[PDB]
Automatic annotation (TrEMBL), chain A:
GO CC annotations, alphabetized: membrane
Record bears the keyword Cell inner membrane: no
Organism name: Legionella pneumophila
Lineage, opening ranks: Bacteria, Pseudomonadati, Pseudomonadota, Gammaproteobacteria, Legionellales
Annotated ranges, domain OmpA-like: 32-149
Presence of keyword Membrane: yes
Section covered of the full-length record: 40 to 188 of 189
Protein name: LphA (DotK)
UniProt KW keywords: Membrane
TrEMBL record, chains C, G:
One GO term describing the cellular component: membrane
Span of domain OmpA-like: 57-171
Keyword Membrane found: yes
Organism: Legionella pneumophila subsp. pneumophila (strain Philadelphia 1 / ATCC 33152 / DSM 7513)
Protein name: Outer membrane protein, OmpA family protein
Transmembrane keyword on record: yes
Full-protein positions shown: 42 to 234 of 249
UniProt keyword annotations, A-Z: Membrane, Transmembrane, Transmembrane helix
Automatic annotation (TrEMBL), chain D:
Name of the protein described by the UniProt record: DotD
Keyword Lipoprotein recorded: yes
Pfam families the UniProt entry points to: DotD
PROSITE patterns membership: PROKAR_LIPOPROTEIN
Record InterPro entries: DotD, DotD_sf
From TrEMBL, chain F:
Top-level taxon of origin: Bacteria
Name assigned to this protein: DotF
Length: 149, 91, 171, 139, 160, 59, 171, 136
């Protein structure tokens, strides 16, 4: 009569969508009990504007379906971009991008308590090759959480 | 008419030793223990009891709670900001 | 052949033995050598052992468990697990220009000074083993943290077991 | 063809009865709040006690139904501030219930401070980067 | 040519430019319309108008400050409108390719960016409505450290 | 009486009062009811007076 | 083709795609185009979605439900229901000289200022969406009323649901 | 393709229920704003951090008893002098400090907050002394 597992969750399904996201190009990493999802900005937004494409909602649905498989308390969404005009414009752009991404994620049914959003601009790059625009590898959105129990 | 201070059996409940002469109850859905001695439950858990109401309460040094309350087959608790239920059997 | 205690700190001539025994083909031995000397085969062998590799951007990180690669509650290196250490040296040989950081982490059991001293001793031992295989001393730095920034929960058994580790980072 | 625009999903009479109760509860609260505001006009705002600064403008959406201390510690840790507690915590716990969507951490702290009432208070010191929770001098 | 005028008090003014002037006017001007097709730079210090219609075609620099009841702004390409410090109750702003507008709407704001254009506001209006077509973008562009900063309401929360 | 700022520029400001009378204020000038102006802020709508109060925008 | 988010505010070339796909007849494609571009087909399409059209004398009125064409308790426009908005623009394109009045209405639940502000915000949002598609700003005016002049009873569920609406009138 | 919210009020009774809940929450927030009373930070009667070099050392305190003994031990650990001005009552002032890693100045601030109106703690750093002053 008691439940036998977390409802709507399967380890084989978790492995399947992890492999599928890694083949598509969305970076999924797990160290200990911490989980990281890294998405390039070109696969979500337009050329340096906080407007989502219409075709990125399928990828956002896949990310939400991956996120429904775990139990968690807080999620963090952080945005990074590249240098275009000044620092105020890129910080505002990253904050708007994180706001829109977390708005759609909260609209979908993730069972979290708190979602934090920040945009850091271009303060923390991961690659010294900074020749591209939104095609650069260091223009991205990062989703971090910790699996609870 | 000074009211009584507390029940000193909650110290043994805090340590985890059941009261003498009591019987065990089965708790499902969370990390909690319960005993029944004199038609009252004694509950040892580190969660927060929300709905049914308790009569006496003690707290340990590491954050464990001990409650004295009347019998009920259900408990409403808050885990990490989320409200859920615990099932009590064997009453 | 190969000496099991670290091959006397000599560069192992692994390929010539296989291409000399695969003749009684030379092209088949060369194909086997160029397959087994690849970086992905070294990563997959380290994956068969209990050592984790993480690459993100231009930074690479190796995670090594002290519970299997050290003797218990000591800074001594466990000599039974020498293929993992040899594969670590083989993987680190592919980047001859980067700087190396090694860090030690333990769980929450014990005293603060004991945790700091044990982590520092294990970090010094791993840094010395890296130094003795050819890596220069100016490219190395070791640090031991306690239970400062853990990656799992210390209130559960498996999560506390996952927290005792050695981290190797390079650019 | 004759049609009228709102054609939604079919409704349940239990939800109908709950809505009929909730409308009367809502305008009773509206009348009582109007009378209360007319009798007692407030004169001070908690902007002075809780000011804003940089990296308090990161945003959050929260649905929390538990005690105040863990949520305040999580907000302070996200805002990269130190957390301080003053006073003795009461034996009966101080319970809050927050359900918001996409507002700033200063506004979150102000709503938590207003919902705490006479039991606890929130102070923010930005020069020392400290979020402080103090309990009331009662019991 | 350059022009520096200190003190104008008129109840009506209509300015149209076709070449490359560098003109600044001080005083009190009840402006009504403005069209630019040349390479002009114009700055007025104080205005008190009722309905302004601004059209910028090729490369224009306009710097206004004052009180305007209703503002309409059309930028076509390579045009910069610095309507900061010009508080408008009603604002309609349309930007086409590679043009920049910086507005200060107060009550009602309606903005459209078509393609690789930028619209910036500096005040939180009571009603905000922004649209993006190809690569344009409308950004918040506020201080984040001001002690009297205002948050979004139920009636202002629009997600781009 | 009380004053509110109407428009602001680097260098000077435009003020409106409760009676509907306009005024133009410099960095160094005297206005009634407030005293001496020591600072004019352009990024934020603040005019600091010698009496210890700030003229801001209307609400 | 067609971009689902408002086609980048461009006039759609609907006829040429149909007459290019119905060739492998040109006359059959022209007949289909002149049928589907008619005013009555647009009115019946708006009847297939939940938008009501009333014509009486020389004044025309469109009734749009906020419960389906707006997100809940927000002035945000629901992007899923874009064919209805595109059909509204297509119907309003037939009268390039008239003036437009848009009005917002809610039910009786809430405070008076809250109802007025929500109606005003929804009216401004709908007017801005009309303005961004080509209609000039001098032909538009938006007004938000509360529960002032309703069309159904607010003491019943369906009648209260029928009262939350956007009214578009033109001559 | 964009999806609707799963817990969306697509029902004509659930819409009314949810907007009634929103109005109730807004009215409760207004009532809380009316009833809450605050103090300005200029006249807040709480001891500030005395920011001396000897008072930044970490400490680990578990104590539940009289204020004078703990304050004397804190002064000895901070290498200050300690003096008392006033008269001890029949019922002593009881505090409770349980911290693992906290500065001595913050411990003294928490002691002064928990003492209330009965006693106050003053710190003089030029002549390094801690004064415990009772209320008449």
């Amino acid at each position: 009569k008691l439940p036998c597992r977390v409802d709507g969750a399967c380890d084989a399904t978790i492995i399947k969508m992890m492999t599928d996201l890694n083949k598509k190009g969305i970076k999924v990493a797990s160290v200990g009990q911490n989980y990281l999802i890294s998405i390039p900005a070109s696969a979500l937004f337009a050329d340096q504007s906080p407007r989502l494409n219409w075709a990125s909602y399928s990828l956002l649905n896949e990310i939400a379906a991956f996120l429904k498989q775990f139990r968690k308390i807080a999620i963090t969404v952080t945005s990074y971009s590249s240098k275009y005009v000044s620092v105020k414009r890129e910080r505002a752009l990253t904050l708007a991008r994180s706001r829109v991404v977390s708005e759609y994620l909260w609209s979908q049914g993730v069972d979290s308590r708190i979602i934090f959003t920040q945009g850091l601009g271009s303060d923390k790059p991961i690659t010294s090759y900074t020749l591209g625009g939104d095609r650069s590898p260091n223009a991205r959105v990062e989703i971090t959480f910790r699996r609870a129990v | 008419g000074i009211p009584p201070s507390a029940n000193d059996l909650l110290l043994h409940v805090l340590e985890g030793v059941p009261p003498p002469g009591s019987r065990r109850l089965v708790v499902s859905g969370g990390d909690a223990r319960a005993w029944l001695s004199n038609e009252k439950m004694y509950v040892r858990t580190n969660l927060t009891i929300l709905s049914p109401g308790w009569l006496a309460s003690m707290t340990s040094a590491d954050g464990t709670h001990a409650y004295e309350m009347q019998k009920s087959p259900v408990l409403l608790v808050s885990w990490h900001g989320k409200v859920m239920q615990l099932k009590v059997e064997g009453l | 052949c190969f000496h099991p205690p670290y091959n006397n700190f000599q560069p192992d001539r692994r390929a010539v033995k296989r291409v000399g025994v695969d003749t009684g083909g030379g092209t088949v031995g060369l194909v086997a050598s160029i397959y087994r000397d690849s970086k992905r085969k070294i990563i997959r062998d380290l994956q068969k052992q209990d050592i984790q590799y993480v690459e993100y951007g231009d930074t690479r990180t190796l995670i090594i468990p002290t519970d299997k690669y050290f003797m218990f509650s000591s800074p001594r290196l466990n000599e039974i697990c020498y293929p993992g250490l040899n594969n670590v040296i083989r993987l680190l040989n592919f980047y001859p220009q980067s700087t190396i950081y090694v860090a030690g982490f333990t769980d929450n059991v014990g005293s603060r000074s004991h945790k700091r001293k044990l982590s520092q001793a294990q970090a010094e031992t791993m840094m010395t083993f890296l130094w003795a295989n050819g890596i220069a001393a100016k490219r190395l730095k070791a640090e031991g943290y306690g239970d400062k920034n853990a990656i799992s929960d210390n209130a559960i058994i498996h999560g506390s077991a996952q927290n005792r580790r050695i981290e190797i980072q390079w650019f | 063809k004759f049609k009228k625009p709102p054609i939604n999903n079919p409704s349940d009479d239990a939800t109908i009865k709950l809505a009929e109760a909730a409308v009367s509860v809502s305008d009773s609260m509206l009348e009582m709040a109007k009378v209360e505001k007319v009798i007692t006009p407030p004169s001070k705002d908690n902007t002075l006690t809780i000011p804003n600064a940089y990296n308090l403008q990161a945003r959050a959406s929260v649905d929390w139904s538990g005690p105040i201390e863990e949520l305040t510690a999580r907000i302070a840790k996200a805002a990269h501030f130190r957390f301080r507690v003053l006073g003795k915590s009461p034996s009966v716990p101080v319970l809050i219930s927050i359900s918001t969507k996409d507002e700033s951490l200063a506004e979150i702290l102000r709503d938590i401070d207003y919902q705490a009432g006479k039991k606890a208070s929130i102070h923010v010191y930005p020069n020392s980067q400290v979020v402080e929770l103090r309990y009331a001098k009662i019991y | 040519g350059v022009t520096q005028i200190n003190g104008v008090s008129s109840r009506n003014l209509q300015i149209v430019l076709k070449g490359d002037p560098k003109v600044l006017i001080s005083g009190f001007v009840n402006l009504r319309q403005l069209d630019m097709y040349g390479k002009g730079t114009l700055s007025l210090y104080w205005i008190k108008s009722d309905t302004l219609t601004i059209r910028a075609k090729k490369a224009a620099k306009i710097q206004l400050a004052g009180i305007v009841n209703r503002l309409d702004v059309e930028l076509w390409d390579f045009a910069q409108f610095k309507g900061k410090y010009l508080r408008a109750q009603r604002s309609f702003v349309k930007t086409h390719d590679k043009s920049v507008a910086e507005i200060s709407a107060v009550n009602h704001q309606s903005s459209l960016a078509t393609d690789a254009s930028d619209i910036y506001y500096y005040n939180l209006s009571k009603t905000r409505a922004d649209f993006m077509a190809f690569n344009g973008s409308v950004l918040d562009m506020r201080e984040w450290g001001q002690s009297d900063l205002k948050d979004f309401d139920r009636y202002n929360k629009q997600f781009p | 009486i009380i004053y509110y700022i109407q428009a602001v520029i680097p260098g000077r400001a435009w003020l409106i009062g409760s009676n509907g009378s306009t005024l133009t204020v410099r960095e160094g000038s005297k206005i009634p009811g407030y005293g001496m102006v020591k600072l004019i802020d352009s990024l934020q709508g603040r005019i600091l007076t010698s009496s210890g109060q700030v003229i801001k925008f209307s609400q």
